[PDB]
């Protein structure tokens, strides 16, 4: 209804912090409206307070309530919280009680620092990631000048702008401002820095090629990054090394010290082999970042322990994969961080991976980085052949392309292909176009929307008219209703192109609400969310080549009220897994499965001291793999549910949430308790499965 949001003031309250609960409320009923605004507040399945309001609203008129609310003692708590304003309708939030973030993280990213940003736009885009998701922190992606120079500098004077390794221009004064913002919500900073790159001719800031690790036993090759313009390079530097620690953990403490961070986000390039020392030494380079991280860890602490914070990032994570089970183990890092590629790509695989690292780990936080549909086209798709073309024509003669066809030879002046699209609400769109080149090097076409001039893009050279690829897009704002995208091949384009179609580049709501409900049900979550509410496509975050659409934005919403409200019952370090035991689940009229199989209902058991929890999660009519676009799932009505326990255990009471039901409010359903042949056991029907619920039952 007419609760538009509902929302706190900060990311994170320390117990007997002040907690602003605001509600942003619209009559648009009919008439004048009448009637009160009822905040409860819900620690699990237990009410813990209650307040009123009353609300008069003349019809159209808006107003924001304010709720407040004293923190409870208890820390390392999460709370739902609901409000309810009878025929206006309801809202939704959570709060996180939580002295340190990194016991429940919830890890967004800024990527982008351009000077137009003003104080107010970088309070705005922090606010929102804080308000709807609760993100209680940010990695600050490519805001240093240098890899190895980090606060560029003119003598003891911070330079106000400098120009990143792309060619963008940072701004000192957005990134403080940033910074400001985020510490406005409780939120904590940590600076992207790598663990062992330079930039290129790095001798001159003194440091050494000794240092550095070589893919020869001569030192006459150093392993390296080259970004293709015969300028631009990283070089790497072995993490043991005593001088490069030295050299880097000073660029940590100013980093730390001088632009305000709370912490470092640690990176790498993931794995590399056969590397060597500048003496010839044959090293294991997967062992050697934890004796780095641990050096780090103490002389960030030993500067300001309330600026401490660190992660790194364990690339390629699978079980017992490169540098997984060292990192994880050894590291003195706060919480675990990993990159997923191509080595966990089942839902049961990653489900593994995560709980690896949870032991190894001792039960630190695991933060995922899982690009979703990262390999796919997805969006609404426009094809080429289909649209409205001028001075070419279609053809069929090389494989690969979609639809029926192709545009082909795109490689003359006044040569266009005209898409007439469909923007089904007003926002940021993604034009992404699949195309073919052969042409020996990059080809260029002008990009026109609606008639105007946006942008030069680039169609980059494969080496057969047979490979294709999407990987040229703009993103670009649009008005709700039709509008006109143009490649036209005018004085100054290069080369040419074939081109298979346009796409609306979109995530797939179905995916990524499957996706983030196996991770958090798992034990991690998941870093997907930055800037002004971007969802992150691509490992350079600001990429823009997908979109979410306002209905994801929702279902993310309700998915982050849910991590938050209910973190204690899927992160806390007595949540372990209950596959070691005399137990199972069965459910009446569906597939089931306790492994992730495709189109089941898959179940996962969890306990606590205190509960016994069953997830459920619904891959009826859907394949085992996590990150690629998905269909809607088989919904499920009152479906029946027997669960068999240890002969220890009596269940005081059953209770489901669900961030698909009702806003993740906890439901108590009726059950009954019986003993049979297979074991002691509990049963009930569930009244309804969309993607995940989480069941958790009270033990006596
Ligand atoms: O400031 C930022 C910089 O610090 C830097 O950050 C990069 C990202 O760092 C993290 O992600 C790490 C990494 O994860 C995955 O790789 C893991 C993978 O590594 C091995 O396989 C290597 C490689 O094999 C095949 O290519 C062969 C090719 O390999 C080397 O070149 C690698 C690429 O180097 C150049 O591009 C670098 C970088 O540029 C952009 O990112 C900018 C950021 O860089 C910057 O903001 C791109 O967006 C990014 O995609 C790209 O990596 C070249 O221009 C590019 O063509 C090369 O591919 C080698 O040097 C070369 O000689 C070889 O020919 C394979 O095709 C390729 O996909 C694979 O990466 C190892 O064997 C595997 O086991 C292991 O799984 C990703 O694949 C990789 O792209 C990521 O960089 C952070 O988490 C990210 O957020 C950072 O963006
Ligand atoms: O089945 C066959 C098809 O696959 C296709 O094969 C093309 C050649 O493939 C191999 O060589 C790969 C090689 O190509 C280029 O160098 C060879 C090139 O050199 C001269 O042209 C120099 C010219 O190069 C660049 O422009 C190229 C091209 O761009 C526009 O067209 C794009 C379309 O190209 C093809 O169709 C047009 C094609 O049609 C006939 O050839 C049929 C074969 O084509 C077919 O059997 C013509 O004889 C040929 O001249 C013409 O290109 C694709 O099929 C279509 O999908 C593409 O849209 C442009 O309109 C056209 O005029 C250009 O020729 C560069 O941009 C430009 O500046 C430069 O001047 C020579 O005159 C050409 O005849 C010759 O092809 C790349 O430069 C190089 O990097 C690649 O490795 C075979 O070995 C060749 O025998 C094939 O011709
Ligand atoms: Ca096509
Ligand atoms: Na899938």
């Not at 550095?212 to 072995?238: A, R």
């Not at 993310?556 to 991590?563: E, L, P, Q």
């Not at 308790?673 to 074991?679: E, F, I, P, R």
């Amino acid at each position: 209804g007419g609760i538009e949001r509902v929302f706190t003031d900060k990311a994170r309250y320390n117990p007997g912090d002040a907690v602003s609960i605001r509600v942003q409320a619209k009559n648009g009923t009919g008439s004048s409206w009448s009637g009160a605004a009822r905040l409860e507040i819900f620690h699990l399945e237990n009410s813990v307070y209650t307040s009123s309001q009353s609300l008069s609203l003349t019809n159209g008129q808006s107003t924001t309530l304010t709720f407040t609310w004293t923190a409870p003692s208890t820390d390392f708590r999460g709370y739902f919280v609901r409000i309810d304003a009878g025929t206006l309708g309801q809202g939704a939030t959570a709060i996180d009680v939580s002295s340190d973030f990194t016991k429940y993280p919830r890890y967004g990213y800024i990527s982008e620092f351009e000077s137009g940003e003003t104080a107010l736009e970088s309070k705005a885009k922090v606010d929102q990631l804080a308000q709807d998701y609760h993100i209680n922190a940010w990695q600050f992606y490519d805001w240093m000048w240098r890899h190895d120079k980090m606060i560029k500098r003119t003598g003891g004077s911070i330079d106000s702008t400098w120009l990143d390794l792309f060619n963008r221009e940072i701004s000192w004064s957005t990134l403080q401002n940033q910074i400001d913002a985020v510490h406005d919500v409780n939120g904590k900073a940590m600076a992207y820095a790598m663990i062992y790159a330079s930039r290129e001719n790095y001798s001159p800031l003194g440091i050494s090629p000794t240092w550095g690790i070589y893919e020869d036993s001569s030192h006459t090759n150093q392993f390296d990054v080259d970004f293709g313009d015969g300028s631009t390079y990283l070089y790497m530097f072995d993490p043991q090394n005593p001088n490069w620690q030295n050299y880097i953990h000073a660029e940590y403490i100013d980093s730390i010290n001088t632009a305000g961070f709370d912490g470092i986000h640690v990176a790498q390039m993931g794995q590399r082999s056969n590397v060597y020392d500048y003496n010839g030494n044959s090293i294991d380079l997967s062992t050697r970042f934890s004796p780095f991280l641990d050096q780090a860890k103490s002389v960030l602490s030993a500067n300001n322990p309330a600026r401490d914070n660190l992660t790194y990032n364990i690339v390629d994570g699978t079980v017992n994969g490169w540098a997984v089970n060292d990192v994880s183990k050894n590291a003195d890092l706060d919480f675990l961080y990993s990159e997923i590629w191509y080595l966990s790509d089942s839902y049961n695989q990653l489900k593994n991976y995560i709980e690896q690292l949870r032991a190894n780990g001792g039960n630190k936080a695991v933060v995922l980085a899982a690009y979703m549909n990262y390999a796919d086209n997805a969006g609404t798709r426009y094809e080429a052949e289909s649209a409205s073309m001028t001075n070419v024509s279609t053809n069929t003669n090389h494989a690969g392309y979609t639809g029926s066809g192709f545009v082909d030879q795109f490689a003359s002046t006044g040569d266009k292909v005209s898409f007439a699209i469909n923007a089904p609400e007003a926002g940021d769109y993604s034009l992404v176009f699949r195309y073919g080149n052969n042409t020996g090097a990059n080809s260029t076409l002008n990009l026109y929307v609606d008639g105007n001039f946006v942008q030069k893009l680039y169609f980059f050279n494969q080496s057969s008219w047979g490979t294709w690829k999407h990987d040229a897009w703009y993103q670009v704002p649009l008005t709700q209703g039709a509008h006109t995208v143009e490649l036209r091949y005018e004085s100054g384009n290069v080369g040419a192109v074939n081109l298979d179609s346009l796409t609306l580049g979109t995530f797939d709501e179905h995916s990524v609400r499957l996706a983030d409900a196996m991770m958090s049900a798992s034990g991690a979550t998941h870093i997907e969310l930055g800037d002004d509410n971007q969802m992150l496509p691509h490992e350079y975050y600001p990429n823009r080549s997908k979109t979410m659409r306002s209905s994801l934005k929702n279902a993310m919403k309700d998915h982050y009220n849910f991590i938050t409200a209910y973190e204690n019952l899927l992160f806390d370090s007595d949540v372990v897994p209950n596959d070691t035991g005399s137990q199972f689940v069965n459910l009446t009229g569906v597939s089931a499965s306790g492994d992730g199989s495709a189109n089941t209902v898959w179940y996962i058991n969890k306990r606590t001291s205190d509960y016994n929890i069953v997830h459920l999660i619904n891959l009826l009519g859907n394949d085992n793999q996590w990150r690629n676009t998905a269909s809607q799932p088989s919904f499920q009505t009152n479906l029946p549910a027997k669960i068999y326990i240890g002969a220890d255990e009596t269940i005081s009471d059953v209770y489901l949430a669900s961030p698909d039901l009702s806003g993740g409010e906890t439901q108590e359903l009726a059950f009954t308790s019986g003993t049979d042949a297979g074991g002691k056991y509990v049963s009930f029907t569930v009244p309804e499965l969309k993607y995940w619920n989480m069941i958790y039952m009270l033990e006596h």
